[PDB]
Amino acid sequence: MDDDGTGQKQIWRIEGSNKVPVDPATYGQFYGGDSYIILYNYRHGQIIYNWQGAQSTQDEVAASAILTAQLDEELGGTPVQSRVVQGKEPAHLMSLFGGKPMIIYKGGTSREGGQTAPASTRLFQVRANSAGATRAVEVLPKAGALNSNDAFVLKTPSAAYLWVGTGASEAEKTGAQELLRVLRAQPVQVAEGSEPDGFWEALGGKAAYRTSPRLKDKKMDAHPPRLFACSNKIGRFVIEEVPGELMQEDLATDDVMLLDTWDQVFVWVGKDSQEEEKTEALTSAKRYIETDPANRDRRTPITVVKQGFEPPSFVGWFLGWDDDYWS
């Protein structure tokens, strides 16, 4: 099976000890700190997506998995279950919104604290991938959080803007607006490298963000960056490509990562990694090149970054980072 997404769908959101419905007019939006269940009827059986937000607790996740099964049972167990974790949504689940972007807010109902309060002034990193799939992830309203390769939205009850990075693509331009409407306010369409003095004020700080000649290249949609996991945990060195969208989670604290942005290759060493792992990663990074489609630009720099000390030119490739994460 696989259709538009234009079909009829029902979305729930495991709150405390119950799967409570989600206002149909906000279907698109989700709280990255909770778990949802969504029933979708194709356009020809059904399928249930158990979407587990990145910051949702075990009690929720566990709950959300049980209710997904119980729902499947209740409907005669004909529908298909599909567990998806934040950031790794399948193309289809991603289309259940007529083309609107998938918005993901900070927080959610930590049942023993209830629904958290929006903000006071917030920012979103709006990124999309090859197939146009777009995401708007809420991030801390800091200058250091911007990425020349995406479009951001800065709502600040005082004001509000729609910053658009050099390399930002249409999809992100579009979805950037959709997010503005969705929750309310008119921008101040500002492009990168020519921004007002009061945009920098919303962020309250100075700037110096995530940027690099590759990040600023709007032709990335040719050689997309790729993340590799390099581990020798099984007794031989092996490299696995990291599917889905590059997220801070994807970095194996246990091993050595390869972030090949074509014009350069970051070798990311996990804190608890192994020297032999780093070595072979390098040996390989240096060999991925040379076997070069000569499309392989001259002598690409190989750079080494240690866990917890990654530079902006590296972090700007991960959908929503979190300085405090491995701590």
């Binding site: 778990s35 709950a63 049980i66 209710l67 997904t68 119980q70 567990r83």
Partner: protein, 368 residues
């Protein structure tokens, strides 16, 4: 109205209240009894911690062997003590969730249900499949679970929340076995552990210094070439003994049951065997969702090893993933707690009214 959750293991009883993140009470599934006067009010039976700390006037018995209840009278002792001594509640006042082993015989489920209703007069009850709970605990409803504890090891294929009985594998080698074996080898080493009181010493040496080698033969070699693998363990009398290669030889048993006289294959083969018993369709999902659970899956290194071995049995391409929750000593209990806290359970319960009308049988249609 809070519900009780009970995971009766072969060697441990984890019990508590639904909603809590952890058992409130964990204690040996043992019931003692005079080995044939004492004071006054001579106790016909002591249980758990208390039946251990002593042991001199006893036999020490195990109501559950290899995941299955076999001594029901003594099992009731366990359930009472759980109810009235550890949890400190009265059974008639709380719905109760019990756990069971993968292929628990239809006769056992009934007895279990009968006892809970006719002997403890509970309001309502339910029985879950251990491995399945551990899977829920991780947020999955599909994948193959490895549940190795104190008396048994199970390979349990789960797809969309339901275990696949034709594909389950039972291996009667686990916790206790490995402990006892560790006594044998240590004894051959020169030190002497034979006594039951000493059985417990060894158990701690097992949970603190054993590990699974990535490559048993290399480790064997290294252990024999230097002394880099050796560890010092201070006994209670102060004597310090050094356990070396026996650190990994012990749980090496898992992968080579051959080491304790068993004919069976290793936990990696049974896993493969099991996966291959399931539809060719869901086998990918299975390989990506190896969820470990149980005390015996806590050995440092078993996860990776488990990955190595299966990677060599599975087809060249398969993506292998081994999930190893830190909390895995209590997956079963946790998941059960969470499952019983859900508002949807209220309806799933077996009420006493229902039991009075239908009788024990009801457990087969109500639980599943």
């Amino acid at each position: 109205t809070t519900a009780l959750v009970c995971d009766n293991g072969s060697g441990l009883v984890k019990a508590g209240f639904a909603g809590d993140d952890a058992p409130r009470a964990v204690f040996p599934s043992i019931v003692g009894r005079p080995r044939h006067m004492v004071g006054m009010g001579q106790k016909d039976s002591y249980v758990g911690d208390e039946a251990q700390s002593k042991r001199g006037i006893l036999t020490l018995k195990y109501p559950i062997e290899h995941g299955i209840i076999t001594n029901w009278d003594d099992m009731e002792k366990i359930w009472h003590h759980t109810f009235y001594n550890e949890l400190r509640v009265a059974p008639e006042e709380h719905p109760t969730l019990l756990t069971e082993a993968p292929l628990n015989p239809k006769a056992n489920r009934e007895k279990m249900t009968q006892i809970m209703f006719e002997t403890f007069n509970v309001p309502a009850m339910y029985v879950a499949i251990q491995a399945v709970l551990s899977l829920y605990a991780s947020g999955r409803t599909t994948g193959i679970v490895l549940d190795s504890g104190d008396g048994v090891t199970h390979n349990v294929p789960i797809y969309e929340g339901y275990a696949l009985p034709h594909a389950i594998m039972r291996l009667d080698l686990a916790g206790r076995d490995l402990t006892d074996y560790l006594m044998k080898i240590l004894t051959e080493r020169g030190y002497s552990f034979v006594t039951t009181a000493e059985r417990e010493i060894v158990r701690d040496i097992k949970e603190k210094l054993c590990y699974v080698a990535l490559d048993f033969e290399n480790e064997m070699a290294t252990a024999a070439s230097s002394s880099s693998l050796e560890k010092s363990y201070e006994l209670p009398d102060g004597q310090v003994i050094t356990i070396g290669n026996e650190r990994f030889r012990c749980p090496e048993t898992l992968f080579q049951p051959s080491f304790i006289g068993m004919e069976s294959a290793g936990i990696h083969e049974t896993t493969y065997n099991s996966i291959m018993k399931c539809d060719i369709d869901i086998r990918k999902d299975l390989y990506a969702n190896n969820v470990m659970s149980g005390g015996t899956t806590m050995y440092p290194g078993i996860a990776d090893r488990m990955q190595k071995e299966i990677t060599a049995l599975a087809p060249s391409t398969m993506k292998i993933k081994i999930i190893a929750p830190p909390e895995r000593k209590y997956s079963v209990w946790i998941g059960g707690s969470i499952l019983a806290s859900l508002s949807t359970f209220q309806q799933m319960w077996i009420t006493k009214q229902e039991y009075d009308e239908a009788g024990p049988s009801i457990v087969h249609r109500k639980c599943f």
